[PDB]
């Protein structure tokens, strides 16, 4: 429990000893400013709860200052590893916190600040980026396309893999990934087999099928995936050299070393300049193996086995 502000003491002790013999005129412009400073935090807290119906997120600095939050972290019943992690990433801690207004009675205004508990720490995590994989025909509507639908964040947890499909709810601080398990699916470790062999029988990899061949790009951690189809002009450009690669039809990748810009059609993408090593793993596109005549081309939420069964 924290007492962050004592307006009762400041109004009854300082101020309010004004001898109201019709005058009350005991004042100094200093204590007028000082009262404004003390009262402003209450006003800002009242403002925030008025526009958020008593529940706010992230917890603002008015709701909990940095010093108060750090002190709160220091006294929480958690490991020193968890205290160090929360202290070093206070801004993420604020983003993953709620402020719920409880009660105002007995000269006490009380609200609960609901802080995160990071029970899983320092386990390896990886991110999966997927792009559509169509056939390279120039004509429109004459293509069969396939796309892996399991993109997102994956992290090892209690002998399983916690999978976060909406990667926009995960915050990355350098090499650290902050994720909420309430937005996660628990999967067997064999889900990583979809990255070494999509046709493995130990896990049924998730894909979707389509006949719309449209060009796009996916910016990854250390590179860019380019899906070029039809007559779209896809190029990789450098800030000091200009266009240095023209992609052919199909799915290709380029690392961020030597490349600062990827253009797909009329869309220009800046690649991340993060330092790291990239590896191109050669292989035949799996869409080549499928006969278009018996190809199920509107499987929105499907799998490798399910598509094989329909064929």
């Amino acid at each position: 429990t924290f007492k962050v502000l004592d307006l009762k003491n400041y109004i009854d002790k300082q101020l309010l000893p004004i001898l109201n013999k019709q005058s009350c005129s005991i004042s100094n412009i200093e204590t007028v400013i000082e009262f404004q400073q003390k009262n402003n935090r209450l006003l800002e807290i009242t403002r925030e709860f008025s526009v958020n119906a008593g529940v706010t997120t992230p917890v603002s600095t008015y709701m909990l200052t940095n010093s108060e939050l750090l002190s709160l972290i220091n006294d929480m019943p958690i490991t020193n590893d968890q205290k160090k992690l929360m202290s070093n990433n206070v801004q993420i801690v604020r983003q993953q916190s709620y402020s719920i207004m409880c009660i105002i009675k007995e000269e006490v205004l009380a609200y609960v600040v609901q802080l995160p508990l990071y029970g899983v720490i320092d386990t390896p995590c990886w991110k999966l980026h997927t792009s559509p994989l169509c056939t390279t025909n120039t004509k429109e509507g004459s293509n069969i396309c396939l796309t892996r639908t399991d993109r997102g964040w994956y992290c090892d947890n209690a002998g399983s893999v916690s999978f976060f499909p909406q990667a926009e709810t995960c915050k990355v601080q350098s090499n650290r990934v902050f994720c909420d398990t309430m937005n996660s699916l628990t999967l067997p470790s064999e889900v990583n087999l979809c990255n070494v062999d999509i046709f493995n029988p130990k896990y049924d990899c998730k894909i979707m099928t389509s006949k719309t061949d449209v060009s796009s790009s996916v910016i990854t951690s250390l590179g860019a995936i380019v899906s070029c189809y039809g007559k779209t002009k896809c190029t990789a450009s450098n800030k000091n050299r200009g266009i240095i690669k023209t992609f052919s039809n199909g799915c290709d990748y380029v690392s961020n070393k030597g490349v600062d810009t990827v253009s797909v059609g009329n869309t220009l993408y800046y690649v991340n300049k993060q330092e790291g090593k990239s590896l191109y793993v050669k292989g035949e596109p799996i869409i080549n193996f499928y006969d278009p005549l018996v190809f199920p081309s509107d499987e929105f939420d499907a799998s490798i086995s399910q598509v094989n069964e329909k064929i």
Partner: antibody, heavy 121, light 108 residues
């Protein structure tokens, strides 16, 4: 290690004001609100009041409101108490105390050496 | 709020078990009862907080028990250094009130 060092012994004539100091070592004033307690010789302890510098606030018990003033000085890491309108029943040993954890609430962990105050005649 | 201690003076031989009582006028909120040991002419030392939890570094010969109105401090076997005064404080309500104190003296 947090510790408190108090001022020397004082002897004062009745009706005057006495001001006792308490300097904290090993900890910040904002991290350690200071409670002022006293005991007359032979008698038990008596809770006088307390100061919370981090809130810039102070309080005294009903028996000491209007006579006891608690103040803090952060740059010298010191807390001062001042008692006025002295009486024969105000000669006692005065202690400043604190606590090392929030679980104690008001179980006082660290104490000052004490300061003897003699209401003279 | 009143918290009175019993007895005024305790006479026990060294190595015997000491039992000190602290009663209250009304129920102490959350069993917020503390026991301090004070040597002659120095600051009190905190022994028990929460009426049962002993502080850091305090030998396990000191223990606390009780609830509501009545609380007890027990010394399993008295050391020569244990014959000092002992105070009980309540901090479950405002103002915080101490006890009169109990003296433990060597019987001979």
């Amino acid at each position: 290690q947090v510790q408190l060092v108090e001022s020397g012994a004082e002897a004062k004539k009745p009706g005057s004001s006495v001001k006792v100091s308490c300097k904290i070592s090993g900890g910040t004033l904002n991290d350690y609100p200071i409670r002022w307690v006293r005991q007359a010789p032979g008698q038990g302890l008596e809770w006088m009041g307390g100061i919370i510098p981090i809130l810039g606030t102070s309080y005294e018990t009903q028996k000491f409101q209007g006579r006891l003033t608690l103040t803090a000085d952060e740059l010298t890491s010191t807390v001062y108490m001042e008692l006025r309108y002295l009486t024969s029943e105000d000669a006692a040993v005065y202690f400043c105390a604190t606590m090392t954890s929030p679980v104690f609430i008001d179980a006082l962990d660290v104490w000052g050496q004490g300061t003897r105050v003699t209401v003279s005649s | 709020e009143i918290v009175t201690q019993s007895p005024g003076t305790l006479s026990l031989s060294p190595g015997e078990r000491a039992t000190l009582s602290c009663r209250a006028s009304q129920n102490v909120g959350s069993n917020l009862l503390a026991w301090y040991q004070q040597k002659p002419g120095q600051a009190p030392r905190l022994l028990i907080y929460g009426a049962s939890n002993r502080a850091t570094g305090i030998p396990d010969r000191f223990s606390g028990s009780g609830s509501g109105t009545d609380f007890t401090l027990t010394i399993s076997r008295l050391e020569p250094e244990d014959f000092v005064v002992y105070h009980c404080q309540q901090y479950g309500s405002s103002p915080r009130t101490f006890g009169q104190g109990t003296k433990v003296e060597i019987r001979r």
